[PDB]
Design a protein around this motif. Structure first.
Motif, PDB file in Angstrom:
ATOM      1  N   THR A 288      -1.789 -13.277   7.536  1.00  0.00           N
ATOM      2  CA  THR A 288      -1.414 -11.925   7.151  1.00  0.00           C
ATOM      3  C   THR A 288      -2.145 -11.518   5.876  1.00  0.00           C
ATOM      4  N   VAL A 289      -2.661 -10.292   5.863  1.00  0.00           N
ATOM      5  CA  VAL A 289      -3.460  -9.803   4.746  1.00  0.00           C
ATOM      6  C   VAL A 289      -2.858  -8.583   4.068  1.00  0.00           C
ATOM      7  N   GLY A 290      -1.791  -8.007   4.604  1.00  0.00           N
ATOM      8  CA  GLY A 290      -1.191  -6.820   4.031  1.00  0.00           C
ATOM      9  C   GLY A 290      -0.309  -7.144   2.843  1.00  0.00           C
ATOM     10  N   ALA A 291       0.513  -6.168   2.470  1.00  0.00           N
ATOM     11  CA  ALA A 291       1.460  -6.313   1.375  1.00  0.00           C
ATOM     12  C   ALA A 291       2.864  -6.027   1.885  1.00  0.00           C
ATOM     13  N   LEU A 292       3.821  -6.850   1.469  1.00  0.00           N
ATOM     14  CA  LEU A 292       5.197  -6.660   1.904  1.00  0.00           C
ATOM     15  C   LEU A 292       5.724  -5.324   1.392  1.00  0.00           C
TER      16      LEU A 292
ATOM     17  N   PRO B 278       6.088  -5.643  -2.939  1.00  0.00           N
ATOM     18  CA  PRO B 278       4.636  -5.505  -3.117  1.00  0.00           C
ATOM     19  C   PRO B 278       4.168  -5.718  -4.550  1.00  0.00           C
ATOM     20  N   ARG B 279       4.622  -6.807  -5.180  1.00  0.00           N
ATOM     21  CA  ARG B 279       4.132  -7.205  -6.495  1.00  0.00           C
ATOM     22  C   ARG B 279       3.919  -8.711  -6.578  1.00  0.00           C
ATOM     23  N   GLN B 280       3.852  -9.393  -5.439  1.00  0.00           N
ATOM     24  CA  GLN B 280       3.719 -10.838  -5.373  1.00  0.00           C
ATOM     25  C   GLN B 280       2.532 -11.191  -4.489  1.00  0.00           C
ATOM     26  N   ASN B 281       2.139 -12.466  -4.536  1.00  0.00           N
ATOM     27  CA  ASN B 281       1.028 -12.959  -3.732  1.00  0.00           C
ATOM     28  C   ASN B 281       1.432 -14.143  -2.862  1.00  0.00           C
ATOM     29  N   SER B 282       2.732 -14.340  -2.636  1.00  0.00           N
ATOM     30  CA  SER B 282       3.218 -15.486  -1.872  1.00  0.00           C
ATOM     31  C   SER B 282       3.404 -15.144  -0.396  1.00  0.00           C
ATOM     32  N   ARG B 283       4.225 -14.140  -0.103  1.00  0.00           N
ATOM     33  CA  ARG B 283       4.499 -13.709   1.261  1.00  0.00           C
ATOM     34  C   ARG B 283       3.930 -12.314   1.473  1.00  0.00           C
ATOM     35  N   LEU B 284       3.134 -12.156   2.524  1.00  0.00           N
ATOM     36  CA  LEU B 284       2.450 -10.907   2.831  1.00  0.00           C
ATOM     37  C   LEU B 284       2.899 -10.392   4.197  1.00  0.00           C
ATOM     38  N   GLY B 285       2.393  -9.218   4.569  1.00  0.00           N
ATOM     39  CA  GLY B 285       2.806  -8.575   5.805  1.00  0.00           C
ATOM     40  C   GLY B 285       1.662  -8.141   6.698  1.00  0.00           C
TER      41      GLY B 285
ATOM     42  N   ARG C 145       9.457 -20.073   3.620  1.00  0.00           N
ATOM     43  CA  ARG C 145       8.716 -20.225   4.870  1.00  0.00           C
ATOM     44  C   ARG C 145       9.298 -21.339   5.730  1.00  0.00           C
TER      45      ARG C 145
ATOM     46  N   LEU D 173       8.420  -9.168   9.191  1.00  0.00           N
ATOM     47  CA  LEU D 173       7.281  -8.294   9.446  1.00  0.00           C
ATOM     48  C   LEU D 173       7.702  -6.933   9.980  1.00  0.00           C
TER      49      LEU D 173
ATOM     50  N   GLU E 122      -0.659   1.833  -0.463  1.00  0.00           N
ATOM     51  CA  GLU E 122      -0.007   0.646   0.078  1.00  0.00           C
ATOM     52  C   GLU E 122       1.149   0.187  -0.800  1.00  0.00           C
TER      53      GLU E 122
ATOM     54  N   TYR F 216      -7.321   2.844   6.792  1.00  0.00           N
ATOM     55  CA  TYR F 216      -8.234   1.718   6.677  1.00  0.00           C
ATOM     56  C   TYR F 216      -9.571   2.011   7.339  1.00  0.00           C
TER      57      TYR F 216
ATOM     58  N   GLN G 137      -9.677  -6.906  -1.014  1.00  0.00           N
ATOM     59  CA  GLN G 137      -8.785  -8.060  -1.008  1.00  0.00           C
ATOM     60  C   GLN G 137      -8.690  -8.686  -2.393  1.00  0.00           C
TER      61      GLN G 137
ATOM     62  N   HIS H 298      -5.443  -8.656  -4.911  1.00  0.00           N
ATOM     63  CA  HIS H 298      -4.936  -9.953  -5.349  1.00  0.00           C
ATOM     64  C   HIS H 298      -4.789 -10.003  -6.864  1.00  0.00           C
TER      65      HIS H 298
ATOM     66  N   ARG I  21      -1.888  -7.351  -8.134  1.00  0.00           N
ATOM     67  CA  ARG I  21      -0.483  -7.693  -7.943  1.00  0.00           C
ATOM     68  C   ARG I  21       0.041  -8.688  -8.973  1.00  0.00           C
TER      69      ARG I  21
END
Lengths: 184, 220, 109, 104
Positions: free
Chosen positions: A32-36, A40-47, B7, B37, B93, B112, B127, B131, B134
């Motif tokens: 996954t490459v989006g943002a939750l 949307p201020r973290q880099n652990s879990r994405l959407g 996870r 999701l 986004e 996009y 990307q 990164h 954030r």
RNA sequence: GGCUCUGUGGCGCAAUGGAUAGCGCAUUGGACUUCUAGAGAAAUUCAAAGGUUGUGGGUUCGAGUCCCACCAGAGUC
């Protein structure tokens, strides 16, 4: 027949129900490459969207599961173009053959850039299972330096993984050799 | 709420058994992933900023006064407030704007394929930009007066940052793919000369995975 | 070349004095330019094949397959997968052992 | 042909107060220690590289990003950062963690 | 001299709905893997802290959430 949007050499899946049918039915994962939306201020879990490797996209295309479409019409992956520049290269064909051969056996697959390899080979779903192998794709006639094998063996020992060597013969069958440290 | 799940619930396994106890943890881990999701965002209409995309000129220009993000993003010209395509995409986004296009609302998709193009910013650069953004960094554009693309400031400089006279950046980055050849000595020397007195960091993107390596000279 | 015989003698000395093996014998294969140290680690047990190699050399995949086939032919026991060990030495007698087999059959380090 | 290069490398690292030893278990060429009494048992791991003065060079080690990542990951327990030596330039490579450098 | 925006644990930020203030990265404490103390990036992974919501007034059944004054700092005419 699910839809995949291919454009500028990237394949993204936007529906939330087509992703579920890919993981359970055909055993193909992705990153996954989006943002939750929630966090949307973290880099652990994405959407969403989900990024597909070129080998995964080709495997979905050939076996008749999804239809590749251009950026808004069907797209043909057998001819080199601006939306599919992957046709006509040796490394891509090598990787696709190895990916298909390992996938037919019943393994899960993933990227292994940080571990100095090509693929990660799982015994099951990447959830609830440690990876077992670090696969490397080598042409049959290439020479492998011995200084670059000791580092791979040491990393495999330190991470508890085994190294695989893959080189498809011109007969359409691939041979595998396993390397590991032996203490005596 | 605000807490997000984990996870895999605990340590992983080594070898499959098929003993009906390993097939229940897998189901419980799987059904908690697609419940995440499917979530979609929602915001009140009283805290949205409108904007319009102008492909002819190549910017995004606002039609309302900006908010807290103005201290670090955007640029003002001819009395109006304008944004770069990557900054506009990040704001959309994140949910801080309500971008339109010819009086037609847009989605996260079908944008996009309007802003992400070889003429404007690419995919890998966006990307890396998101990164770093954030995590609280201040990411800017490298004005000379593979190539250096961004200027990055630490998270301690956000509080009193000044757009007109920012100062000396923490570092500056060049985004590259992971399956591409390592630059030779001459290219690294030229890049070091062009960067100046600040460190140079190499960003590698491998199908959605980012790692950074720093090349320093003169050990002794 | 004297490199192969020198490395073979170094490996033989290491296996005798340090690892304490018995009845280690040198068998020549003048078709692949390789030397096999087919010895017996424990009396009344299975055989092993060791192929010493300096760090200067490089190996392809066809050569590896040929070496496994030759080792299987020498062992003459079509009950276990093909396997052999590789020994790498330096100028100060430092030896590291790695084992190469066939198939996967190996989830360990 | 590499014997001469090893000889110049050994002599250059021998002139100073560094005692060099060969490292075969890590995929490098030399390991530089310092001082008589032990302090850290390791200070550097050096990869000897040779290039020619036409910006192309004849490389005995086809370095790429995968090999460099593996070497950096391995050379963490037994060294104090990788060292690329050119025949002289000493470029040092290290890993930049993104979430550990956002504040002092 | 006007006009627009900002002020919450060590840092970046939520609290939209009138709450009673909590997510992430850092720090601390555990459990595992590995190396000759140390290291740990889908070989890694759990738990916990904590704080004049800038300073005073009024409205509030009720104030981070509304009105005024004061302090600080970022753009613009």
């Amino acid at each position: 027949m699910l839809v995949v949007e291919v454009a500028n050499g990237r394949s993204l899946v936007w529906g939330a129900e087509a992703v579920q049918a890919l993981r359970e039915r055909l055993g193909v994962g992705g990153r996954t490459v989006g943002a939750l939306p929630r966090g949307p201020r973290q880099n652990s879990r994405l959407g969403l969207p989900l990024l597909l490797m070129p080998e995964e996209a080709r495997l979905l295309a050939e076996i008749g599961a999804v239809t590749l479409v251009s950026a808004p019409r069907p797209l043909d992956w057998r001819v080199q173009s601006k939306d599919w520049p992957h046709a006509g290269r040796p490394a891509h064909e090598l990787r696709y053959s190895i990916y298909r051969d390992l996938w037919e056996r019943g393994f899960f697959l993933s990227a292994a850039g940080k571990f100095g390899g090509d693929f990660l080979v799982y015994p099951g779903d990447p959830l609830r299972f440690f990876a077992h192998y670090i696969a490397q794709c080598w042409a049959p006639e290439d020479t492998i330096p011995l200084q670059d094998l000791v580092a791979a063996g040491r990393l495999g020992t330190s991470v508890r993984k085994t190294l695989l060597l893959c080189s498809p013969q011109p007969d359409g069958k691939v041979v595998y050799t396993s390397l590991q440290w032996a203490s005596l | 709420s605000q807490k997000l799940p984990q996870r895999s619930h605990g340590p992983k396994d080594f070898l499959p058994d098929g003993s009906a106890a390993q097939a229940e943890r897998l189901r419980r881990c799987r059904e908690e992933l697609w419940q995440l999701l499917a979530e979609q965002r929602v915001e009140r209409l009283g805290s949205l900023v409108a904007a319009e995309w102008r492909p002819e000129e190549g910017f995004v220009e606002l039609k309302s006064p900006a908010g807290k993000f103005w201290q670090t993003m955007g640029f003002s010209e001819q009395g109006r407030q304008r944004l770069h395509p990557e900054e506009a995409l990040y704001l959309l986004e994140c949910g801080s704007i309500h971008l339109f296009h010819q009086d037609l609302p847009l989605s996260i998709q079908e944008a996009y394929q309007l802003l992400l193009t070889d003429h404007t910013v690419t995919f890998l650069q966006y990307q890396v930009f998101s990164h770093l953004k954030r995590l609280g960094y201040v990411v800017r554009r490298f004005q000379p007066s593979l190539e250096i693309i961004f200027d990055v400031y630490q998270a301690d400089a956000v509080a009193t940052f000044r757009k007109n006279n920012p100062g000396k950046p923490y570092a500056r980055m060049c985004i590259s793919g992971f399956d591409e050849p390592v630059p030779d000595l001459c290219s690294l020397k030229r890049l070091s000369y062009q960067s100046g007195d600040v460190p140079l960091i190499f960003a590698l993107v491998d199908h959605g995975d980012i790692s950074f390596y720093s090349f320093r000279d003169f050990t002794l | 070349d004297a490199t192969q015989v020198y490395v073979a003698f170094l490996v033989y000395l290491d296996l005798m004095e340090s690892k304490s093996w018995h009845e280690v014998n040198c068998v020549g294969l003048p078709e692949l330019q390789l030397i096999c140290l087919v010895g017996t680690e424990i009396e009344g047990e299975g055989l092993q094949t060791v192929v010493p190699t300096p760090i200067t050399a490089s190996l392809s995949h066809n050569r590896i397959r040929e070496i496994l086939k030759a080792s299987r032919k020498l062992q003459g026991d079509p009950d276990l997968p093909m396997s052999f060990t590789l020994a790498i030495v330096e100028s100060d007698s430092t030896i590291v052992y790695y084992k190469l087999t066939d198939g996967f059959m190996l989830p360990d380090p | 042909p590499t014997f001469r290069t090893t000889y110049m490398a050994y002599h250059y690292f021998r002139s100073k107060g560094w005692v060099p030893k060969v490292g075969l278990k890590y995929g490098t060429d030399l390991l530089l220690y310092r001082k008589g009494p032990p302090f850290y048992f390791a200070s550097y791991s050096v990869i000897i590289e040779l290039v020619d003065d036409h910006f192309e060079g004849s490389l005995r080690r086809p370095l790429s990003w995968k090999s460099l990542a593996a070497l950096s990951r391995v050379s963490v327990n037994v060294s104090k950062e990788l060292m690329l030596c050119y025949l002289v330039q000493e470029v040092i490579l290290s890993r930049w963690v993104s979430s550990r450098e956002r504040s002092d």
